[PDB]
Ligand binder design. Structure first.
Ligand SMILES: *[C@@H]1O[C@H](CO)[C@@H](O)[C@H](O)[C@H]1NC(C)=O
Ligand SMILES: *[C@@H]1O[C@H](CO)[C@@H](O)[C@H](O)[C@H]1NC(C)=O
Ligand SMILES: *[C@@H]1O[C@H](CO)[C@@H](O)[C@H](O)[C@H]1NC(C)=O
Ligand SMILES: *[C@@H]1O[C@H](CO)[C@@H](O)[C@H](O)[C@H]1NC(C)=O
Lengths: 384, 384
């Protein structure tokens, strides 16, 4: 009863006689499966993960400038040159300035000037690549056992891992047998065309070309404590207004600009990186066995321990307490179209209440729980 | 000789007989004025300033979030409400979540949830308005005196202030008289349509509508230590992915985004705010008097104290030293089309050299400085 309370909940019933049920799990959704003489299951796709990621390119979003140097020449003395022009850490620019007697040259004319600034990246973002061969899907299965605290509890449930290599897996359901999962991980997208952009805590999924065409300084994917940046001029600007001076300034943090650019992109939790995805599976229930089919009927009384309330999908939840000593026994259930969602409701201990999910028909109907005169009669109306 | 060495230099000569010269000064430019029997002047527009500015609107570029509160209700209990919804410091959002037995409600259905976050701006930018009634133009005038250190020296020169109210002004030129400035401050742009955007040290001139349509939280121009921001949701986002949770996060610094948006805008030095502008003036030289017109000629020798060099505009600079005792005297100057830029070159002291700017004709010409056999003869060729 994990999906009881989830709005995006699907009910799937297997074909007549078949012991297999085909389901489509998607993020934020829950599917309830029913089969004749089989336990009612609540299956959910918990998370979709990428296990190991290789960084393709690394982009600088905030940088600073240090160790500025400059060299100037008088007219007709040739272009000025600095060794830092061949240092890949520095960004340099050549220009011409007005030179004459007033500024220390014998000749009047245009004199060469060159400025170099060492560039250091303060904050960067990464673009890691995801290949579907490394994707891991985690599925969670919860049996409708009637357990006391079962309704909407995300603590209990058996998890099973599906990978592109290990697509079929078996999940051991305690006291109910073994479930088969024959899933086919359909990519949903071409992963070469998409790149995982990670910035600080946050992460997104963006187009490869869009990431590569980001107007930011970039460096190879290989991590280095001292990296060599290209396109450093996309953050460093040289200004020479009136041929007197040349000042170099850095562009400032592009963090918020990236946030705006990432508005229309799919966002991903953390940077453990969990995707929002889907997965199609075939559930083999041949090895699944209903726990209390061989139990006898409960000969005593049931008492309502909680008000009957309606689910968003029209089903009702009944919490009953048994007052007899023959447990474990089968709960007598009959409607005076009316069916059960929970298959084979049973009492395990007298002290523990039982939760039953039922699908009453539209209109007035009488839910009879127990047998005989002392049976519980709950009148109910289902309005469409 | 302030413009000697400036590349953007204009030469203007007054009409025949007139004692007035019309000039157009613009930022980064220098104009040299000549008139018969009048001192040669080097006029320049130093700066254009706005004296007092009123802030129209103030926009937040970086904010943070504190004191988050939230309230939730079970289904059919009505919409949740917080008092912080009526606090203008908080940004709030209403949503609906899945509620049922599992999360503490007796009824299954959609339950109301409301979240509020107190917003605080960390960094802001201002949009101050400039009206042409407060503009101040500063003009600098430098006489061609022949002074020892006059070439390109920006230390010497008389400054005069022109304002839209005080358009005509008089500038006292020591030893040369009084200059009249009849300027007409033409706006160049409609100042209501333009707003001065100031961010940290930097400032720009942008369109009013563009500034008002900036997607940032804004507040009135009046300065307050505790301001009230509008459009706070332009920096604060609420995320509710699957009807389980609602997390509130701030957008981050928009500083670099603003820098990119301001790429095509005119930049202004500091935030003392100096514009790049122009000014048209009429120079009245009726009260200007040439210092040494009544001096006698220099009867002795001149010696070249520095190599003759050519200016970017074809003129030549001659630095001579006088070796006689009759100073002050008129320097004999003759070409063997050839004219002087510096009007009435004179020797003031024997120990101080004299700088003369001359315009030699194209081709071969002989510059004769001094009189007699002992006169200085400098051969020169001007190539076009
Ligand atoms: C770079 O310049 C600064 C100038 O303050 C100096 O401290 C530093 O030693 C220089 N070199 C390196 C490698 O930091
Ligand atoms: C949820 O399940 C755990 C596991 O048995 C149980 O201990 C807990 O009390 C339950 N709580 C609920 C349903 O609130
Ligand atoms: C806001 O919340 C914080 C919670 O840490 C608290 O310290 C503070 O006193 C609260 N109110 C104000 C006015 O800061
Ligand atoms: C510039 O002018 C000042 C003012 O007389 C003078 O003291 C200085 O030596 C000059 N320096 C130059 C032209 O380098």
């Amino acid at each position: 009863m994990r999906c009881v309370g989830v709005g995006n909940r699907d009910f799937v019933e297997g074909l007549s006689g078949a012991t297999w049920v085909d389901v489509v799990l998607e993020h934020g959704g829950c599917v309830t499966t029913m089969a004749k003489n089989k336990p009612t299951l609540d299956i959910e796709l918990q998370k979709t993960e990428a296990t190991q990621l290789a960084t393709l390119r690394k982009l600088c979003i905030e940088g600073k400038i240090t160790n500025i140097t400059t060299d100037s020449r008088c007219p007709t003395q040739g272009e000025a040159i600095l060794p830092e022009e061949q240092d890949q850490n520095y960004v340099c620019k050549h220009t011409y300035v007005d030179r004459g007697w007033g500024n220390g040259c014998g000749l009047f004319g245009k004199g060469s000037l060159v400025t170099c600034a060492k560039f250091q990246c303060l904050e960067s973002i990464e673009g890691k690549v995801v290949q579907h061969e490394n994707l891991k899907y985690t599925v969670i299965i919860t049996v409708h056992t009637g357990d006391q605290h079962q309704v909407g509890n995300e603590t209990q449930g058996v998890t099973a891992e599906i990978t592109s290599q290990a697509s079929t897996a078996e999940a051991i359901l305690p006291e109910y047998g073994t479930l088969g999962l024959e899933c086919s991980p359909r990519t949903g997208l071409d992963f070469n065309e998409m790149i995982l952009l990670t910035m600080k805590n946050k992460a997104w999924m963006v187009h490869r070309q869009w990431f590569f065409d980001l107007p930011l300084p970039w460096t190879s994917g290989a991590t280095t404590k001292t990296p060599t940046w290209n396109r450093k001029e996309l953050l460093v600007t040289f200004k020479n207004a009136h041929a007197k001076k040349q000042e170099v300034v850095v562009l400032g943090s592009q963090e918020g600009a990236m946030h705006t650019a990432l508005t229309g992109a799919t966002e991903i939790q953390t940077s453990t990186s969990i995707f929002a995805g889907h997965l199609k599976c075939r559930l083999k229930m041949d090895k699944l066995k209903l726990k209390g089919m061989s139990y006898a009927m409960c000969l005593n009384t049931f008492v309502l321990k909680k008000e009957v309330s309606e689910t968003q999908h029209g089903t009702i939840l009944i919490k009953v307490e048994y007052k007899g000593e023959d447990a474990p026994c089968k709960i007598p259930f009959s409607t005076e179209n009316g069916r059960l969602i929970t298959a084979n409701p049973v009492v395990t201990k007298k002290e523990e209440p039982v939760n039953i999910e039922a699908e009453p028909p539209f209109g007035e109907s009488n839910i009879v729980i127990g047998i005989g005169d002392k049976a519980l009669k709950i009148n109910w109306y289902r309005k469409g």
